[PDB]
Design a protein around this ligand. Sequence first.
Ligand SMILES: Cc1c(C(F)(F)F)nc2ccc(CCc3nc(-c4ccccc4)cn3C)nn12
Ligand SMILES: [Mg+2]
Ligand SMILES: [Zn+2]
Length: 313
Amino acid sequence: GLMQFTLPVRLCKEIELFHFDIGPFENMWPGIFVYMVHRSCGTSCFELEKLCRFIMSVKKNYRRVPYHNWKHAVTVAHCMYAILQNNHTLFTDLERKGLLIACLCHDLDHRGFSNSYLQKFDHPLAALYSTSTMEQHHFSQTVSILQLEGHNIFSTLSSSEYEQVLEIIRKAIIATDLALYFGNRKQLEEMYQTGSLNLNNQSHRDRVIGLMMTACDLCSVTKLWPVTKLTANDIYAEFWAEGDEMKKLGIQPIPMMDRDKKDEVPQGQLGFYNAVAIPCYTTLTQILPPTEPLLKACRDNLSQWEKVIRGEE
Ligand SMILES: Cc1c(C(F)(F)F)nc2ccc(CCc3nc(-c4ccccc4)cn3C)nn12
Ligand SMILES: [Mg+2]
Ligand SMILES: [Zn+2]
């Protein structure tokens, strides 16, 4: 109870910034996550013993794939931590508890394959869940782990508070299905511009948390250029493996997933920053002004991919 987690000085200062990289020392990531829960939520939010046991079972249920791995989960949780810490008074106690857990869990038991590949393969998960296939799986894996003995980190919440936090987590994880993001951002755009956006309207909060989830999930475009650039290799190593698997089913993959078309990566990144990332952090900055460093960092990285195309790197 008087037992704080404390980080070395450079991490203690830099973890508060949006562009923080959690580093290559896997064994420090649990400690980084508890640090973040303690400062964004309180030392009283979770029993330390239960939280530590939950974090280690979550780690165990992330697979050894190039991108959608344990490092991604903790990276997405740190972005969320930075958003919550720069918007102190906008969020409920339940939201602060739910959203870091949501982020840590959002890609549980990912296999490095998209919803479309599961559908074309005719994976069982595609019959159990006809839309947001992997996302419904991730939430189902989260509930599983919460129900193992000694793993109920929400044990002190009431019956109705428990149901509310699990409902924040469910919508938060569903929102990481990027197919849902485009309509969610348009509605948020229209609502903000016509002045109807109302943070007391629960259906409006939901949308705003959805957009936070997209922003955290895409936060590898908001890092320093060398972090952004090396993560992109991990991202494409998954997509190219999926493309190989499409070719094995007798389907020409899209170019994004076809390793034979590596050369078009720079222009594919441009499209992605313009079509997805920039509009994401733009609408996010409109709704939550203190998240502007994410938009500024995203723009700097677009500018770096423009330099790659111009043969200046
Ligand atoms: C960085 C990043 C992130 C984030 F935010 F998580 F880092 N998420 C994603 C999701 C997708 C992509 C790939 C973006 C993309 N490449 C192509 C392409 C590439 C080579 C040849 C032909 C076409 C098309 N298109 C849309 N990057 N990405
Ligand atoms: Mg996902
Ligand atoms: Zn993710």
